[PDB]
């Protein structure tokens, strides 16, 4: 069986 | 080193806390800038929360994404419990029997032995109990331990010493209680 | 009765300007595996683990990519505030009780430091050791500092002396930690 990773999300950028 | 240029660190930690097996599961997603946690998702909370002001934008941005929120709420099942089921056999159920030795030693450079050492090494998990016996009778006085040492290679070690000046004929016994053996291990040293 | 609490941690980081990335899993303070970014492969802390489970290292690479981006974003958001160097404490220990002519491993445990960049050298009788040594990746801490293990196999003797030399930006000078077998 496969160990799953938690997916990383991108943070909010600047403007 | 002569590289004095500034360093910038970003850590991301996904903690799966399991209580009573899989009875209670808690997911903690932690974002850390340098040595400071800035934003976290706590499954007991159900949404992102700013830990420092530096992380307030992200918490606002990520909370606006309902797909992300639903997936993170379900991560206690799809991620934590899944990995628990995958790794239970060689982590939670890991049992390694300890090697136990007994030898006389000294507290300082000196011409008589003032210590009986019981070395218990190479075991897993860390929960363990050690008892000393003189001529088949437990000695609870003068027992000193080095504590639980985690070696970093999925093993533990500890020393348990009995402060005594052994006399000719006596038989000391170290007894080790550990979940890897159905009967506690006994090692004898004849003085 | 109730069973003890267990915690599995997916710990990853990215560091600039070193461009260093790391991805690992931890179970109750022990490493399950990490992902070697070079060769792009899953390195299990215990080889036997590979016969029970698997992990696609490609995803870890993807995660590290995202981390890199996020680091840069945060770097600008904090007005380019750098990390504060935290010097480590170093402890030299043995895998087991020492016996003459009985093979053993010297463990140099580097603890409670950040950033995760360190220079570790073994010194046998003052002379540096360059082969046969092993090391772990940077291991996570609850205070978000780091841990590290360095290993040196050796034959114990009363004549030889050992030192662990640890260099870190938080240290005023290289840190020497001594060890000897004396009777």
Residue numbers in the entry:
A (entry chain C): 1 to 15
B (entry chain B): 0 to 190
C (entry chain A): 0 to 182
Give the published text.
Analyzing six epitopes, some with very low binding affinity, we solve X-ray crystallographic structures of each bound to HLA-DR1. In summary, each peptide bound HLA-DR1 canonically in the “forward” orientation that is described for HLA-DR,48 excluding CLIP.
S761–775Omicron (BA.1) contains a single mutation positioned at the archetypal P1 anchor position for HLA-DR1. The structure of HLA-DR1-S761–775Omicron (BA.1) was solved at 2.5 Å resolution in space group C 2 2 21 with three copies in the asymmetric unit allowing comparison to HLA-DR1-S761–775Wuhan HU-1 at similar resolutions. These differential registers were supported by omit map analysis, which evidenced that HLA-DR1 can bind S761–775Omicron (BA.1) by accommodating the N764K mutation into the P1 pocket and thus maintain the same binding register as S761–775Wuhan HU-1 (copy 2) but also incorporate the neighboring Leu into P1 (copies 1 and 3) to create a +1 register frameshift, i.e., TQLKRALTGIAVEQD to TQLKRALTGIAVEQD. The HLA-DR1 P1 binding pocket was able to accommodate the P1-Asn (S761–775Wuhan HU-1), P1-Leu, or P1-Lys (S761–775Omicron (BA.1)) within its deep hydrophobic pocket volume. While the +1 frameshifted register of the peptide was present in 2/3 of the copies within the asymmetric unit of the crystal structure, the relative distribution between the two registers in solution is unclear. Despite the results from these structural variants, the complete abrogation of T cell reactivity argues that, under physiological conditions, the shifted +1 register binding is favored. As a result, the frameshifted peptide epitope exhibited a drastically altered peptide landscape to the TCR repertoire compared with HLA-DR1-S761–775Wuhan HU-1, P3, Ala → Arg; P5, Thr → Leu; and P7, Ile → Gly, thus explaining the lack of immune cross-recognition against the Omicron (BA.1) variant of S761–775 peptide in Wuhan HU-1 Spike-experienced HLA-DR1-positive donors.
